[PDB]
């Protein structure tokens, strides 16, 4: 019921940019060299309230 729209990361690789995923589906988020998802995550999914890891590849360096 809570569908998750894949947002736009500024300096990341939005493989599935502009695509809606149904709650329960997953997708990995890659970023430019030096950036990575919070808590060293590589994937983000529509757990319930939305993208649970939250697709924001913050600069790890």
UniProtKB/Swiss-Prot annotation:
Any idea where this protein resides? Answer: Secreted
Cite the post-translational modification comment: Sulfated on tyrosine residues. Another study observed glycosylation at this position.
Q: In which tissues is it expressed?
A: Expressed in the retinal pigment epithelium (at protein level). CFH is one of the most abundant complement components in blood where the liver is the major source of CFH protein in vivo. in addition, CFH is secreted by additional cell types including monocytes, fibroblasts, or endothelial cells.
Listed as disulfide-bonded, the cysteine pairs are 4-46, 31-57
Which residue numbers delimit the Sushi domain?
Answer: 2-59
> Coiled-coil stretches, from where to where?
none
Identify the domain of life: Eukaryota
**What pathology is it implicated in?**
Basal laminar drusen: Drusen are extracellular deposits that accumulate below the retinal pigment epithelium on Bruch membrane. Basal laminar drusen refers to an early adult-onset drusen phenotype that shows a pattern of uniform small, slightly raised yellow subretinal nodules randomly scattered in the macula. In later stages, these drusen often become more numerous, with clustered groups of drusen scattered throughout the retina. In time these small basal laminar drusen may expand and ultimately lead to a serous pigment epithelial detachment of the macula that may result in vision loss. Complement factor H deficiency: A disorder that can manifest as several different phenotypes, including asymptomatic, recurrent bacterial infections, and renal failure. Laboratory features usually include decreased serum levels of factor H, complement component C3, and a decrease in other terminal complement components, indicating activation of the alternative complement pathway. It is associated with a number of renal diseases with variable clinical presentation and progression, including membranoproliferative glomerulonephritis and atypical hemolytic uremic syndrome.
For domains, the record's comment is: Sushi 1-3 domain represents the minimal unit capable of cofactor activity. The property to discriminate self surfaces from non-self surfaces depends on the C-terminal region made of Sushis 19-20.
What does this gene product do? Glycoprotein that plays an essential role in maintaining a well-balanced immune response by modulating complement activation. Acts as a soluble inhibitor of complement, where its binding to self markers such as glycan structures prevents complement activation and amplification on cell surfaces. Accelerates the decay of the complement alternative pathway (AP) C3 convertase C3bBb, thus preventing local formation of more C3b, the central player of the complement amplification loop. As a cofactor of the serine protease factor I, CFH also regulates proteolytic degradation of already-deposited C3b.
* Quaternary context: Homodimer. Also forms homooligomers. Interacts with complement protein C3b; this interaction inhibits complement activation. Interacts with complement protein C3d. Interacts with CR3/ITGAM; this interaction mediates adhesion of neutrophils to pathogens leading to pathogen clearance. Interacts with complement factor I.
This chain belongs to the protein called Complement factor H
Q: State the organism named in the record.
A: Homo sapiens (Human)
Q: Supply the source organism's classification.
A: Eukaryota, Metazoa, Chordata, Craniata, Vertebrata
- What residues of the intact protein does this structure contain? 386 to 446 of 1231
